[PDB]
Nucleic acid binder design. Structure first.
Ligand SMILES: [Zn+2]
Ligand SMILES: [Zn+2]
Lengths: 303, 365, 97, 215, 52, 179, 201, 88
DNA sequence: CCATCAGTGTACTAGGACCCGAAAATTGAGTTACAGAAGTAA
DNA sequence: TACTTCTGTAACTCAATTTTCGGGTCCTAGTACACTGATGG
């Protein structure tokens, strides 16, 4: 009758189809947002990058300079966690130490004579004489004989006497890749791993002699105890053997005051059914975790 | 703001904790869900009426729903499912391979730490937590004490309370670095112990998404973040726009952070811990409701305890360097062995060494 | 090598040897032999006695390369050793390999 | 360790009934003895860990993009699992903020659809305070999905479209000044819109079936 | 995780096909509306020949 | 189109007019490098024009890196003055711009395969050796590196007008091969 | 002029390529020796370039890395002499397509013929869909081979495919991530497999 | 650390030249007084080093130094490896 | 009957190679000058 | 004995390729520590 009805129906149809199009476009936008999330999942990426140097450069890899508080703490000699970190000495490490010390001594004993031979050769090059040249040749032959003698030196005489200064810092870098400090290597070589330290198993007679010497001489001069023991032993080894065979190390008898202390400590440091006895021990004097476990399980248990 | 995955399953976009808590409390406002009360024929009628009003159903329909939807151990287990079958096979294997069949020390320790304070009512009724307090299940990564800490990172998790002033978690984080005793006691070990590091160096600061909250509460405290800010202000380090705060005028409720993202907590000069907020949740009625002790250690790693190198019965009360007797340069001794090995008769040090007081990380942390 | 005979150690060795020469207690040939031995010893020690990494940032003012020696001059430089900072206005780096 | 398989099997056996009543879920629970899933010797630590895993899996299945039947089945699964626990401090279902809108609208739809069983189950879960209203579904450190085609096009949408189209044809027939033929300026309407959308949807479902059919 | 990726991308292709069909429908509707405007203008032009 | 290439490098040569002792220049210059075991020229760098000059014992200097002809000439004169202050009779004779390297972006991906197919006699496209198509334009002796990203690099020209005309000639072809 | 045909024959034998290609290579070598537009280049490099040109021309193109592995020179000189010969001879070679290296790459590997056809179709559709713009056809072939092997019963890691096609595993990953989301639509419609194409690394 | 390295270097040099001192005809007392004089006298910023790799970007210089002794602010330091960056 | 003293069941260490991916850096071609050494080729 | 190529340096472009750099990754092997299980005077 009049296309105005065509217009009304037509833009209402366009409105409904446009609502449908808008809903579909919102679904498409959500899908593309999901896809972006998924690609950033593919492009996503640890805890280790923060641990000690939380702030660190991406070009040099070093964190901020130490705080003045850190400097003051270091001045007071408060050992850091890495300074108190202790690692066991492996057997291959011991063999590497031995070989490195031997090579170090060989190099240190060879460098002087080698340099002397080089100087003799240099003088021979410009001597402007013959008889003096023959004398220099004889001196060079003597130097070469000395070098050969040094080269064929036995290991026993080459190792030293556990008190001579070797290049322990070089061993920490060339021989060892930096896993051991110079002082650690020096102490381990001098006190423990030197061949002049008797590492053989103790004998009953040796143990009895050690006990008698500790009793008579006192348990406070273990250096003199090791020296007087006769056998080549370190004071640390003698003290260790005495302690492992001692009987006064632990009190060996419970008292009412000690029982009260143990009960108080347990009640203070309990978290339920978990009773950490190792942590309890160190407020007790001369006690072991096994003793506390037995005491609290058999006698002091309220049940 | 709404917490959403910034990374697929690893991180969330930075959002204000206050807005998140306000949203949660407004969506549960007056719904009878945030109660914090202990669980409790006449009540049946009231329950039926409530069901009818909430579900737009008749009273008889509500009664039918209540009666029909009711709830619907014993060691034997038969007619097993796949998972129940796996459990049965595992139990049989454990029985045939184990002789004691008890909870290991680590398992009991972890369970007791997790459940140490659950449902513990306050003794005063004045420290009761409000209905909805935005508990943060924070975790503090242990420092590198032993070498293997670099490979696998142990952490201690603490249920910090929302709307709780900072410096209440800093004073609660138990680290051995605060108990360090400075100085060298080689000459005589009977010196009066110097004030623990907790007293000498009170400074510390949190760092949460480019904002250094410094612990300037005490006069002995001074800005540790100043060094970091100056270091960043230098030529160029990517980091920039560092902010600063006081750490006592801010609360965990006013913090804008991410979940699962490593933030920093520095104290005692350079002792750094990684703070990670695992999740944030409203306070329930089956967990601790106290405020005096809510900065609660939910889990700790139970570190190893160093032993005297002479005798393996006691821990290390002293650490000696440059020792003329020890095999290792850093050597650990207890009081007894240290005294017997390092002093002749009255405290005169024998040989040469540098002895320091050592506090066992596995005992005080 | 004629590189490490410019620092405090090498300089002081140079004046000590000169003081012996003017004192008629040592000959110049031994002086130069000792100098070469010191060069070898310091090279070996530094290459094998030292393990510590430094990182320096600056604005390179000038540089120069000739006969296998680099001569950098940097301004407003900061060195970072293991843990400490060393800030200087100007520094000269003489490298040779 | 096989828990997901049990959950999937229970949900499949619930959906194959094409029912929403809690009676069918209770019958399946009693027949499968699913209440004994927690039975078995296991100390408190691993017990609560397994309960946490079960509740998290059930809640994940309760949320989209799963079908309505699967979602309601997972709701009953959550109810049964939480109500039947061996842990004294009953583990709570972790609910995120972003998912609260979906759960609330799902409950509103359930009550609207006269599915009073599921609505009452959810109300009982809420009243018992079995929900830990966390920030994210899981702690952060360091199937029968639903398609968008049904939301786009379905029976009612196409019925309305064809009704509009035929009404449009009628008003075209009546608009023209002459009843014999319509005007030549309006003849661009497409009759293949329904055919085109039917082709698209049939191709989509053909792809879906040849996908879920193994090679 | 490619299962959901492929499901989502296939749904994406299907819904792009639906948008293409609906956009063609909208374009033809707008062309029809332009024709409507033109012919209504022409037809209404037949009765302003007698006005005040 | 309305886009024109922007010059990135300008290589020019000059004759100083006197033999030079490269060792003296290396030892007395401020930023010179002299490695006779690697090359037979002194490499000097300056900041104001940001250019690098290779100075040869024969007295011929090659300046590169300048972004404009005037900048290149100023840099060459600066190097000549620097050499003059070192006690050499250096002059400024026979200054010539030897190469002009410019870059541009047509801002649409290009189908290299079709371009090489229809321009086999000019283009050389070897993905194994270089990911870019090498078009040897013939009217001006210019070489164009054309990439799928739309970036076009023109090289080998002695004058800026040569680069501009080469880009004008190449643009219609790229538009016809708009990916 | 001699000692080059023998060297060409040795190179061809090391590849087990047919004699017609060898005759074409000899003809190209004789030609380039007649123009002498590249006299300064070594005879071995010219022979390698001629062999590459002949292989490309006959329709069984090889890669520069597959001629370097046979010749005594590096890929740089092979490419330089290839360009020089194409310039001097005033001839041209059709651009290599990703389907040319499919048969040889999948025959060197123990992949079945079905996997070969699947990889060829994947690569052709990927290049048609512009999923790998401006990337060498060899990398696209390697990525297609990898996806076809991972989806098929016989699986191959990136290392073996890189060795066979002479493409670094990093390049394989880069060319694989671009076509990663579009894995299914690239596969043949009628393709049987035991490991679903719906899940892949 | 620097004083320890200097002392070690002095000891090594003395031990190496003791043979020449003995041979050429100068008593070891001259050697001892040389050591004492060197040690006693041991008590512009210049870095003498060796270059492992001097990389030059467009304007960024990256220095990799094998070893060196530096004289910063009148204080001597030693490094066995330097990774430095600069902008010309 | 209160102490003993190997075994015990774990997580927690200790070394010990070993891998995974990202970022930076390099190579490679295109031009053109320039001087001198290498590198065959004849 | 000629007669070539091949070094740098510059400068943008892009892909390919290598390098290397911090951290993880997995696996075997002791290690700590509460508890048990007799065990003996
Ligand atoms: Zn701490
Ligand atoms: Zn002890």
């Amino acid at each position: 009758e009049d296309p105005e009805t065509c217009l009304q129906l037509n833009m209402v149809y366009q409105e409904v189809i446009q609502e449908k199009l808008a809903e579909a476009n919102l679904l498409l936008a959500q899908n593309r947002e999901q896809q972006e999330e998924l690609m950033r999942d593919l492009a996503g990426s640890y805890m280790g990058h923060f641990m000690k140097p939380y702030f660190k450069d991406k070009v040099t890899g070093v964190g901020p300079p130490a705080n003045e508080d850190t400097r003051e703490k270091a001045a007071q000699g408060i050992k850091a966690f890495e300074e108190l970190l202790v690692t066991k000495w492996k057997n291959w490490e011991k063999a590497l130490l031995r070989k490195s010390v031997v090579s170090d001594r060989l190099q240190r004993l060879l460098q002087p004579k080698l340099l002397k031979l080089e100087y003799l050769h240099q003088k021979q090059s410009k001597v402007s004489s013959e008889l003096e040249r023959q004398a220099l040749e004889k001196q060079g032959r003597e130097a070469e004989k000395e070098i050969q003698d040094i080269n064929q030196l036995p290991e026993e005489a080459l190792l030293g006497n556990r008190l001579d200064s070797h290049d322990w810092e070089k061993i920490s870098n060339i021989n060892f890749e930096g896993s051991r400090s110079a002082e650690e290597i020096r102490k381990f070589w001098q006190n423990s791993e030197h061949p002049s330290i008797n590492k053989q198993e103790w004998s009953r007679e040796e143990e009895e002699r050690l006990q008698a010497i500790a009793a008579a001489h006192g348990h406070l001069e273990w250096q003199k105890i090791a020296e007087e023991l006769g056998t080549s032993r370190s004071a640390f080894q003698c003290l260790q053997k005495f302690q492992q065979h001692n009987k006064a190390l632990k009190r060996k008898e419970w008292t009412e005051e000690e029982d009260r202390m143990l009960t108080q400590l347990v009640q203070e440091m309990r978290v339920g059914s978990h009773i950490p006895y190792r942590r309890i021990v160190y407020y007790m004097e001369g006690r072991d975790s096994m003793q506390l476990i037995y005491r609290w399980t058999k006698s002091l248990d309220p049940g | 703001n709404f917490p959403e995955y910034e990374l697929p399953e690893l991180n969330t976009r930075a959002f204000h904790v206050g807005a998140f808590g306000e949203l949660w409390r407004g969506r549960l406002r007056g719904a009878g869900d945030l109660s914090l009360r202990e669980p409790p024929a006449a009540d049946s009628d009231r329950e039926d009426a409530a069901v009818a009003r909430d579900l737009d159903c008749s009273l008889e329909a509500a009664a039918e729903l209540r009666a029909v939807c009711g709830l619907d151990e014993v060691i034997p287990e038969n007619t097993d499912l796949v998972t129940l079958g796996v459990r049965k096979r595992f139990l049989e294997h454990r029985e045939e391979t184990i002789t004691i069949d008890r909870a290991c020390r680590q398992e009991t320790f972890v369970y007791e730490m997790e459940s140490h304070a659950i449902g513990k009512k306050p003794e005063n009724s004045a420290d009761m937590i409000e209905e909805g307090e935005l508990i943060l299940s924070v975790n503090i990564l242990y420092p590198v004490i032993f070498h293997k800490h670099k490979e696998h990172k142990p952490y201690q998790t603490m249920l910090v309370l929302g709307s709780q002033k900072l410096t209440q978690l800093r004073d609660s984080i138990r680290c051995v670095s605060d108990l360090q005793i400075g100085g060298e006691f080689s000459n005589t070990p009977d010196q009066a112990p110097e004030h623990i590091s907790k007293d000498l160096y009170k400074s510390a600061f949190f760092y949460f998404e480019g904002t250094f909250y410094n612990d300037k509460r005490y006069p002995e405290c001074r800005d540790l973040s100043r060094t970091i800010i100056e270091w960043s202000e230098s030529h160029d380090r990517g980091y920039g726009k560092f902010q600063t705060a006081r750490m006592e005028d801010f609360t965990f409720n006013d913090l804008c952070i991410k979940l699962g993202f490593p933030y920093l907590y520095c104290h005692q000069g350079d002792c750094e811990h990684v703070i990670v907020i695992t999740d944030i949740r409203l306070v329930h009625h089956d967990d601790c409701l106290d405020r005096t002790l809510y900065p609660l250690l939910i889990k700790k790693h139970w570190l190893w305890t160093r032993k005297c190198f002479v005798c393996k019965m006691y821990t290390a009360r002293w650490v000696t360097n440059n020792d003329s007797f020890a095999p290792e340069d850093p050597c650990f001794f207890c009081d007894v062995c240290f005294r017997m090995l390092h002093y002749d008769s009255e405290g005169n040090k024998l040989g040469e060494f540098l002895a320091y007081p050592y506090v066992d990380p596995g005992t005080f942390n | 090598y004629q590189l490490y005979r410019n620092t405090t150690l090498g300089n002081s060795l140079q004046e000590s040897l000169d003081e012996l020469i003017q004192s008629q207690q040592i000959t110049p040939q031994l002086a130069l032999q000792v100098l070469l031995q010191f060069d070898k010893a310091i090279n070996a020690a530094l290459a094998q006695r030292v393990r510590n990494r430094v990182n320096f940032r600056g604005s390179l003012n000038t540089y120069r390369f000739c006969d296998n020696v680099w001569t950098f001059v940097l301004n407003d430089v900061e060195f970072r050793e293991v843990t400490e900072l060393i800030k200087v206005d100007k520094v000269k780096i003489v490298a040779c390999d | 360790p096989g828990l997901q398989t049990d959950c999937e099997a229970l949900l499949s056996r619930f959906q194959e009934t094409d029912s929403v009543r809690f009676e069918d879920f209770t019958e399946l629970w009693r027949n499968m003895k699913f209440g004994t899933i927690f039975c078995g010797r296991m100390r408190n630590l691993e017990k609560n860990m397994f309960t946490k895993e079960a509740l998290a899996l059930a809640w994940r299945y309760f949320l989209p993009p799963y079908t309505f039947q699967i979602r309601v089945g997972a709701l009953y699964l959550l109810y049964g699992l939480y109500n039947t626990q061996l842990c004294q401090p009953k583990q709570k279902i972790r609910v995120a903020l972003k998912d609260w809108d979906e759960v609330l609208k799902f409950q509103q739809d359930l009550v609207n659809a006269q599915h009073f069983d599921a609505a009452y189950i959810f109300r009982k879960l809420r009243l018992d305070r079995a929900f830990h209203f966390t920030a994210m579904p899981k702690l952060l450190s360091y199937k029968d999905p639903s398609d968008r085609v049904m939301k786009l096009i379905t029976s009612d949408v196409l019925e309305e479209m064809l009704n509009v189209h035929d009404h449009y044809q009628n008003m075209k027939h009546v608009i023209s000044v002459d009843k014999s033929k319509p005007d030549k300026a309006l003849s661009l309407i497409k009759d293949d819109f329904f055919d085109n959308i039917k082709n698209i949807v049939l191709e989509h479902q053909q792809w879906h079936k040849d996908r879920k059919n193994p090679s | 995780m490619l299962s959901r990726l492929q499901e989502l991308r296939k749904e994406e292709e299907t819904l792009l096909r639906l948008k293409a069909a609906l956009h063609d429908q909208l374009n033809r509707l707008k062309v029809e509306e332009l024709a409507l405007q033109s012919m209504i203008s022409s037809r209404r032009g037949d009765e302003m020949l007698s006005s005040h | 189109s309305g886009i024109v290439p922007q010059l990135q490098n300008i290589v020019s040569t000059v004759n100083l007019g006197c033999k030079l002792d490269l060792k003296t220049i290396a030892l007395r210059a401020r930023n010179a490098e002299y490695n006779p075991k690697r090359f037979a020229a002194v490499i000097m760098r300056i900041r104001e024009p940001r250019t690098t000059a290779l100075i040869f014992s024969s007295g011929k200097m090659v300046c590169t890196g300048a972004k404009s002809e005037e900048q290149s000439r100023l840099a060459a004169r600066k190097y000549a003055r620097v050499v003059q202050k070192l006690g050499f009779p250096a002059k400024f004779l026979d200054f010539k711009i030897q190469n002009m390297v410019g870059s541009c972006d047509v801002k649409f991906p290009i189908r290299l395969e079709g371009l090489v197919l229809t321009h086999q006699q000019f283009s050389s496209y070897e993905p194994e050796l270089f990911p870019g198509l090498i078009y040897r334009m013939i009217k001006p002796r210019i070489v164009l590196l054309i990439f799928v990203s739309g970036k076009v690099v023109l090289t080998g020209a002695k004058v800026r007008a040569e680069i501009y005309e080469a880009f004008e000639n190449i643009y219609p072809i790229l538009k016809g091969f708009r990916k | 002029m001699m000692n080059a045909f023998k060297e060409i024959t040795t190179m061809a034998d090391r590849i087990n390529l047919p004699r017609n290609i060898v005759d074409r290579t000899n003809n190209l070598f004789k030609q380039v020796y007649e123009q002498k537009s590249l006299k300064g280049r070594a005879n071995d490099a010219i022979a390698s370039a001629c062999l590459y040109i002949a292989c490309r021309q006959e329709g069984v193109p090889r890669t520069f890395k597959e001629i370097c592995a046979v010749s005594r020179i590096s890929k740089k000189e092979i490419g330089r002499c290839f360009k020089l010969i194409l310039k001097a001879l005033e001839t041209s070679v059709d651009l290599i397509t990703t389907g040319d290296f499919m048969s040889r790459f999948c025959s060197n590997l123990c992949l079945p013929k079905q996997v070969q056809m699947a990889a060829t179709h994947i690569a052709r559709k990927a290049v048609e869909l512009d999923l790998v713009p401006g990337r060498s056809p060899i990398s696209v072939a390697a990525a297609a081979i990898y996806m076809a092997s991972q989806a098929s019963a016989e699986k191959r890691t990136q290392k073996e495919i890189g060795d066979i096609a002479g493409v670094a595993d990093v390049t394989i990953r880069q060319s694989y991530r671009l076509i990663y989301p579009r894995a299914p639509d690239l596969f043949p419609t009628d393709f049987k497999f035991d490991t679903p194409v719906d899940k892949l690394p | 650390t620097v004083p320890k390295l200097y002392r070690s270097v002095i000891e090594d040099v003395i031990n190496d030249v003791r043979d020449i001192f003995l041979d050429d005809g100068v008593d070891e007392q001259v050697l001892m007084e040389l050591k004492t004089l060197w040690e006693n006298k041991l008590m512009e910023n210049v870095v003498v080093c060796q270059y492992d790799k001097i990389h030059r970007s467009k304007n960024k210089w990256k220095f990799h130094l094998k070893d060196g002794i530096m004289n910063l602010n009148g204080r001597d330091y030693i490094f066995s490896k330097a990774i430095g960056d600069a902008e010309w």
